[PDB]
């Protein structure tokens with residue numbers, strides 16, 4: 001009779017003249033991502049930003065604006081926030097720059113310097129961001145270590161709302177979908193719920209614990225549903241104690257309602273984060289230390305007025 005409550009999120013249209021120092025950061029199936037500085041006019045601030053483009057066409061602009069709709073409607077420290085959009089021939093999305101990139105690249109590049117505390121804290125933070133999306137009735141549908149960004153080694157956020165839907169279940173209609181992160185009911189019946197996102201969370205945690213191994217490496221996507229139906233799962237990572245591996249296996253149960261809830265994953269990983277060497281066995285753990293605020297990436301002329309997007313709020 002009333003469906004859902006009104007979505008009073010604000011969508012900010014940002015002037016192209018407010019952006020300086022645009023440089024390409026990287027490209028892929030997600031499109032092209034640039035870095036830059038957003039200098040809102042009449043305000044003495046310089047905000048480091050990332051700008052995404054689907055690498056002009058009508059269908060591309062509709063898809064980027066659905067992602068803008070979802071991201072403008074989310075406000076959580078562990079979820080990427082849309083700062084606004086820029087209306088060039090192709091619509092661009094503006095968000096906070098995450099200078100350490102994605103967690104998939106990060107764990108591969110720094111695998112010898114990552115301790116148990118960081119890994120278990122990232123699990124807590126990803127579960128917090130996903131629990132927030134569940135409170136907002138959003139099913140992400142593309143949770144993976146490539147879609148978790150690193151603001152600092154101590155603070156990660158979930159990104160890429162290209163497949164996200166506002167749901168008891170959601171039913172997809174074709175398109176390319178990442179099979180190796182999907183729950184079995186999603187591969188077979190296109191059923192997507194917060195509990196199918198829990199399965200993707202399990203795979204994401206396995207990616208972190210294996211320092212960026214490819215799930216089911218060398219196995220074609222077409223053979224994954226058969227492997228899962230036979231009861232096969234991703235193997236126990238060498239650093240994982242049975243306590244951590246059991247949590248991953250619970251995420252991959254056939255019965256979606258038997259899987260943990262994101263709020264329970266926050267609790268379990270938070271208890272483990274209090275004594276991280278009891279739960280992850282890493283050769284040379286806790287001597288290693290990754291960077292923290294307490295910004296070389298910035299040019300000297302910008303340093304004084306630089307403000308991170310997390311400290312730039314608007315009424």
Ligand SMILES: */C(=C\C(=O)N1CCC[C@]1(C)C#Cc1cnccc1[C@H]1NC2=C(C(=O)NCC2)[C@@H]1Nc1cccc(Cl)c1OC)CN(C)C
Pocket residue numbers: 025026027028030033049050051052071080081082093094095096097098099101102103104105146147149159160161
């Ligand atoms: C991931 C690597 C990775 O993402 N990299 C490494 C090279 C630079 C690039 C492409 C980046 C970035 C970046 C930086 N700051 C903030 C956001 C992003 C950004 N990266 C990705 C995003 C995404 O949506 N999909 C996946 C890659 C992402 N998001 C952005 C960017 C701009 C605006 C918006 Cl609103 C936003 O989020 C929607 C490793 N993978 C290649 C495996």
Ligand SMILES: [Cl-]
Pocket residue numbers: 178
């Ligand atoms: Cl993929």
Ligand SMILES: [Cl-]
Pocket residue numbers: 214
């Ligand atoms: Cl890869």
